[PDB]
Design a protein around this ligand. Structure first.
Ligand SMILES: *[C@@H]1O[C@H](CO)[C@@H](O[C@@H]2O[C@H](CO)[C@@H](O)[C@H](O)[C@H]2NC(C)=O)[C@H](O)[C@H]1NC(C)=O
Ligand SMILES: *[C@@H]1O[C@H](CO)[C@@H](O[C@@H]2O[C@H](CO)[C@@H](O)[C@H](O)[C@H]2NC(C)=O)[C@H](O)[C@H]1NC(C)=O
Ligand SMILES: *[C@@H]1O[C@H](CO)[C@@H](O[C@@H]2O[C@H](CO)[C@@H](O)[C@H](O)[C@H]2NC(C)=O)[C@H](O)[C@H]1NC(C)=O
Ligand SMILES: *[C@@H]1O[C@H](CO)[C@@H](O)[C@H](O)[C@H]1NC(C)=O
Ligand SMILES: *[C@@H]1O[C@H](CO)[C@@H](O)[C@H](O)[C@H]1NC(C)=O
Ligand SMILES: *[C@@H]1O[C@H](CO)[C@@H](O)[C@H](O)[C@H]1NC(C)=O
Ligand SMILES: *[C@@H]1O[C@H](CO)[C@@H](O)[C@H](O)[C@H]1NC(C)=O
Ligand SMILES: *[C@@H]1O[C@H](CO)[C@@H](O)[C@H](O)[C@H]1NC(C)=O
Ligand SMILES: *[C@@H]1O[C@H](CO)[C@@H](O)[C@H](O)[C@H]1NC(C)=O
Lengths: 295, 277, 48
């Protein structure tokens, strides 16, 4: 009656609407996660270099997962600038630079973009538009030894460091009669040690710090891309390798070539897809739908 | 340390005819018993291709300069695996990133990295007369590398390396493309029984790899191997082999997909009015 | 004096959300400031 927009209906058959089966139990299927960059090598490393000679590592061509690092809760400081601790999983970048070093308690504040300080100016200067994260965790049981761990060194005298600049040439600094490269008046040593003690408090205890920066300009490393289980014989919203569709998956007798992922029927419509997890071929058929006539 | 190899006679370049070759799968879509018209970078049917020889008989050692416009079809007619690898780049002197692929005696190396490439890079296999054995001994390709961004080495294995006598019995077809920062390599192998030709018939090349390199390539070169048992630049034997190089351009092809799902025939859309129809 | 919400799970047009309950980012802290949960409000800090 609403379809004909009248309160009287003549004898006959009328097409009113279309019954469609709503999809249920949506599934996402992504390939096996078996290629992870050695984040443990950066973190779990037995020894760390000095802050003026911080360890530099490249990260690319993996399937990274930052959720485990965030949920570890073993890090005293986890500060991300330009990104959030969450939502970092599903982002891709061309490459990642990892800078590892060891600092003291008060040095944590100085390791930040836009923050002034002697160390932030002569040891490690962060760019103003820095995008990435900084992770600092206490290492009183590893980087602190009875009697003084003086293995970690920081520049003390310097005439300014550009962002992400490495300066291994730290010749004797002249403060103004020149000493001609000899220790003496008007020229002091450029380096100075920390001397971490077990007796030192939280403000002077050693802290292992790793800075991760993401650079993008094709992306090489991406996130875990978590997947779900496989369900058949039901109208399902499926996502196979970024191909999103709706329909029921059934066992198919078609044999795919090893290099072919999904098949298309006549007129470029998807007909069968191979799930990357187990290399199984499934025919996709639209679930039941059709017109509804009123007699 | 690399030294230019002398004693190489100069002969004008030879070009031969390619008959329905250089066809690959445009994408990873499975099709059965259909007709698909696709426009992509391809090699023309019945086209001209550069033919380079390697025969002792001069010694006809060919590792010349070859540009890389949009993609290269590389066919190798061989019997003892003389041709070894390929080099891609622009400056070839460590001032620009370059891609290197070498299948040495034990592994396969794909390395995107900055090489100080020699003007005459090559491989060298030593043959022992006291005991019958052929082994790779020399590899004069690059000097050093400071930055080196992409590394890939396959699992170790063993290769024949022996120089057999007779007609050619192996064909290795490759297609190299560089699009959207992705380096695509398609490959196939075929048994043949010819002495000198580019074999006719239809052969669809299956994709091999799609590396996310993201560099600029406008120049490519080949790497062969030589046999030793004279001086460092005169005492070398080439070994029978040949290779044909063709250049791909954007063309439209009509492919036929059979019930198996493989490409069994194709027609160029701009060759003759019959194929256009 | 001026504050803006920083952490939230989306708002439809023309709504007011006066509630500023602590936001959980994923072990839950159970309404206590600490790990996996940060303050939802942040100040501007206007200076001359
Ligand atoms: C092979 O020949 C080329 C040029 O024919 C040589 O390149 C020269 O290398 C020297 C030192 O490396 C340079 O000073 C010259 O300027 C180069 N010449 C040119 C034209 O580029 C190359 O050194 C030779 N290889 C050898 C001798 O092993
Ligand atoms: C393939 O390329 C060759 C050379 O690049 C072509 O042969 C040349 O043809 C022109 C006239 O069209 C002549 O002036 C040249 O002398 C030829 N080159 C040589 C080395 O003789 C050839 O026509 C091209 N096409 C085919 C099908 O071979
Ligand atoms: C073929 O190339 C591979 C890779 O470049 C070589 O394998 C490397 O050999 C060096 C020297 O012993 C080792 O230090 C590396 O660890 C090897 N890399 C691996 C195994 O991935 C191989 O030696 C080369 N073959 C020959 C005959 O020289
Ligand atoms: C260090 O190694 C342990 C055990 O292998 C692992 O549980 C931990 O997650 C690693 N550290 C990081 C930061 O992932
Ligand atoms: C994917 O990983 C699962 C879990 O180990 C395994 O059973 C399956 O065979 C793997 N599939 C492929 C294609 O590697
Ligand atoms: C036997 O062959 C090997 C190569 O496999 C070679 O290294 C060795 O020198 C040969 N033996 C003699 C006595 O030359
Ligand atoms: C290596 O990369 C750095 C990146 O800053 C660049 O400055 C340098 O020129 C490159 N090449 C060498 C040989 O260091
Ligand atoms: C390739 O050339 C383009 C020219 O616009 C340039 O922008 C790009 O940086 C180059 N890439 C490399 C890897 O040289
Ligand atoms: C597929 O190829 C096989 C031979 O490998 C052949 O016997 C068969 O007829 C082809 N077609 C099919 C299975 O539909």
């Amino acid at each position: 009656k609403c379809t004909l927009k009248s309160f009287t209906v003549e004898k006959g058959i009328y097409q009113t609407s279309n019954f469609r089966v709503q999809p249920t139990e949506s599934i996402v299927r992504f390939p096996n996660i078996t290629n992870l960059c050695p984040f443990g090598e950066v973190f779990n490393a037995t020894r760390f270099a000095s802050v003026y000679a911080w360890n530099r590592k490249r990260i690319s061509n993996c399937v990274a997962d930052y959720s485990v690092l965030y949920n570890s809760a073993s890090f005293s400081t986890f500060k991300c600038y330009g990104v959030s601790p969450t939502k970092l999983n599903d982002l891709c970048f061309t490459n990642v630079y990892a800078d590892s070093f060891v600092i003291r308690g008060d040095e944590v504040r100085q390791i930040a973009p836009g923050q002034t300080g002697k160390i932030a100016d002569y040891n490690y200067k962060l760019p103003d538009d820095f995008t990435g994260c900084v992770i600092a965790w206490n290492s009183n049981n590893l980087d602190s030894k009875v009697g003084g761990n003086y293995n970690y060194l920081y520049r003390l005298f310097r005439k300014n460091l550009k962002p992400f600049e490495r300066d291994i040439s730290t010749e004797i600094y002249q403060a103004g009669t020149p000493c001609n490269g000899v220790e003496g008046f008007n020229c002091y040593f450029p380096l100075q040690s920390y001397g971490f003690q077990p007796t030192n408090g939280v403000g002077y205890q050693p802290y292992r710090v790793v800075v991760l920066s993401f650079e993008l300009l094709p992306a090489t490393v991406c996130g875990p891309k978590k997947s779900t289980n496989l369900v058949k014989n039901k109208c399902v919203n499926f996502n196979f390798n970024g191909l999103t569709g709706t329909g029921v998956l059934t066992e198919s007798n078609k044999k795919f070539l090893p290099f072919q992922q999904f098949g298309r029927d006549i007129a470029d419509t998807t007909d069968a897809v191979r799930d990357p997890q187990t290399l199984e071929i499934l025919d996709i058929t639209p679930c039941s739908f059709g017109g509804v006539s009123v007699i | 340390q690399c030294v230019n190899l002398t004693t190489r006679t100069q002969l004008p370049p030879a070009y031969t005819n390619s008959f329905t070759r250089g066809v690959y799968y445009p994408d990873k879509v499975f099709r059965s018993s259909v007709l698909h018209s696709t426009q992509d970078l391809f090699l023309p049917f019945f086209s001209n291709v550069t033919w380079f020889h390697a025969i002792h008989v001069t010694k006809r050692f060919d590792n010349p300069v070859l540009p890389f416009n949009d993609g290269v079809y590389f066919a190798s007619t061989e019997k003892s695996n003389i041709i070894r690898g390929w080099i891609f780049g622009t400056t070839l002197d460590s001032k620009t990133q370059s891609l290197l692929i070498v299948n040495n005696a034990t592994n396969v190396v794909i390395k995107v990295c900055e090489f100080q490439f020699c003007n005459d890079p090559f491989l060298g296999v030593y043959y022992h007369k006291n005991n019958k054995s052929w082994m790779e001994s020399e590899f004069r390709v690059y000097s050093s590398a400071n930055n080196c961004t992409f590394e890939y080495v396959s699992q170790p294995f063993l290769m024949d390396l022996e120089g057999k006598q007779g007609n050619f019995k192996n064909l290795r077809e490759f297609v190299f493309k560089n699009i959207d920062g992705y380096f695509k390599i398609y490959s196939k192998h075929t048994p043949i029984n010819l002495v000198r030709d580019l074999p006719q018939g239809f052969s669809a090349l299956e994709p091999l790899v799609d590396l996310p390199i993201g560099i600029n390539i406008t120049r490519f070169q080949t790497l062969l191997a030589l046999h030793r048992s004279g001086d460092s630049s005169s005492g070398w034997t080439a070994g029978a082999a040949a290779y044909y190089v063709g250049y791909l351009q954007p063309r439209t092809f009509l492919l036929k997909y059979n019930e198996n799902g493989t490409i069994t025939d194709a027609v160029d859309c701009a060759l003759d009015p019959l194929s256009e129809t």
